[PDB]
């Protein structure tokens, strides 16, 4: 289930291509002698969208580490229960 719920969320980060839309703003910011009403405005949503990219990539980690740490609890709930060394007395008595 962690294998199935983490494959699609990674591809949401790869082909997001919102930095390419920033590159569309990059030809619209410096390359024209552009209106400062819109030069401030183009950088405004750019500052949102990079933070939206940070909130994208951090909401991966919450969904990511919400399963990895959820798995590390489960290994330690298995790796502690010794059952062989608690029975080697009980085997050899019956084996005798």
């Amino acid at each position: 289930d962690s294998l199935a719920q983490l494959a699609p969320v990674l591809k949401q980060l790869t082909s997001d291509a919102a930095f390419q839309t920033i590159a569309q703003i990059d030809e619209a910011l410096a390359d024209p002698s552009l209106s400062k009403d819109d030069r401030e405005a183009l950088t405004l949503e750019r500052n949102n969208l990079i933070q939206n990219l940070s909130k994208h990539i951090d909401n991966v980690i919450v969904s990511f580490t919400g399963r990895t740490s959820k798995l590390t609890n489960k290994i330690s709930d298995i790796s502690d229960m010794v059952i062989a060394e608690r029975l080697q007395d009980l085997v050899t008595q019956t084996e005798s």
Binding site: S76, D77, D80, M81
Partner: peptide, 13 residues
């Protein structure tokens, strides 16, 4: 934690 959930079962067992 140190006192795991398997510890508390082993007592209640």
């Amino acid at each position: 934690g140190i006192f795991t959930k398997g510890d508390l079962i082993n007592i209640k067992l």
